[PDB]
Design a protein around this ligand. Structure first.
Ligand SMILES: CC1CCN(C(=O)Nc2ccc(Cl)cc2)CC1
Ligand SMILES: CC1CCN(C(=O)Nc2ccc(Cl)cc2)CC1
Lengths: 194, 194
């Protein structure tokens, strides 16, 4: 029931974020959807902003955990497929949570905690990217061109901006149904190209 | 004097944005710096947000006009230098106006007019990028890989996110003194790589 009311608040928030921004969702809306009173809501979360932080934390950790699984279970693959399957973890995980994704990205501007969470995970994903590039260079598959960590940083920042623009249908954006091929091409050419 | 007071308001705003966000700059601060009264300020601009819109408009048009000049005067160049000199227009123009750059990007979230301005110019820069890629393909220098406009979109979005992260000293970011080489490498490998 503690778990239960908390989970219901989170599910309600994710559902309501599909139709309007967090600014237009009230605590009364969250409490009503979750089948609790307003003061009961405040037992579980201090604010609607804290609800969004918890949602984003769950989605970012879901992506991270999926990437860790993939890292433990090398799909038998060419180099291009290796990177495609990895980028796809983010494409599918965040694409399955577009409202939380969008609201989380917006909250980076106003929430130190959201900004630090995103920063922390991006640093982790960049470091892993650089470690893979380093291993591809050590095995003779990739040439020693740019500093690996700098290349990794620009490619991860490209994926952040490009994927989220595509999900939002921003003008300009890559169509969602083209974003994987687009990013994979740029990663493979920049990592393996002389 | 109309031009003059308006220019002074703009110069004051750009100076104050170097030390604090627009939210922490008052109309009294702008009027004081510009040597006018508060009601005189409102003759020239309806809000501090309108001042920022005008500043951003001037900086984006400065970049655009520089790119047009470059487009008219082909530096004699290899393909890599062609793209480096082009990316550099943005690196130098926006790097020379970091406070307006930063504040303008933040305002995209809250100002339809700022969002539309940025969108309009990004569409223009993407279309030009795609036209150059198309010409490189027509002359036999670049292979016919991704749809040119989709490639152009992802590369321009990479440059937006990467350049602005670098200017802000965001964690993560590419160091400013490495961002040109980083982006050039990714553009040249992705445009010319099979
Ligand atoms: C080994 C790497 C596989 C590819 N990868 C990514 O696609 N990064 C990524 C994707 C989406 C966002 Cl929003 C941010 C970063 C990093 C880890
Ligand atoms: C022919 C092309 C030269 C390279 N170029 C860019 O660097 N785009 C760019 C740079 C910075 C930002 Cl913030 C946004 C876009 C586009 C036009």
């Amino acid at each position: 029931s503690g778990d239960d009311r908390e989970l219901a608040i989170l599910a309600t928030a994710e559902n309501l974020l599909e139709d309007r921004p967090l600014a237009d969702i009230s605590v009364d809306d969250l409490a009503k959807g979750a089948g609790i009173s307003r003061p009961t809501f405040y037992f579980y979360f201090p604010s609607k902003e804290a609800v969004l932080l918890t949602l984003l934390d769950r989605v970012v950790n879901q992506a991270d955990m999926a990437l860790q699984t993939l890292a433990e279970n090398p799909a038998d693959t060419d180099r291009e497929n290796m990177w495609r399957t990895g980028i796809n973890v983010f494409f599918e995980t965040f694409g399955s949570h577009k409202a939380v994704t969008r609201a989380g990205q917006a909250a980076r501007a106003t929430s130190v905690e959201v900004a630090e969470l995103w920063s922390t995970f991006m640093q982790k994903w960049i470091a892993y990217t650089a470690a893979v590039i380093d291993a591809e260079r050590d095995r003779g598959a990739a040439p020693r061109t740019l500093p690996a960590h700098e290349l990794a940083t620009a490619l991860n920042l490209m994926n952040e901006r490009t994927l989220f623009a595509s999900f939002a249908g921003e003008q300009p954006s890559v169509p969602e149904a083209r974003v994987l091929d687009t990013l994979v091409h740029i990663w493979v050419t920049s990592i393996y190209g002389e």
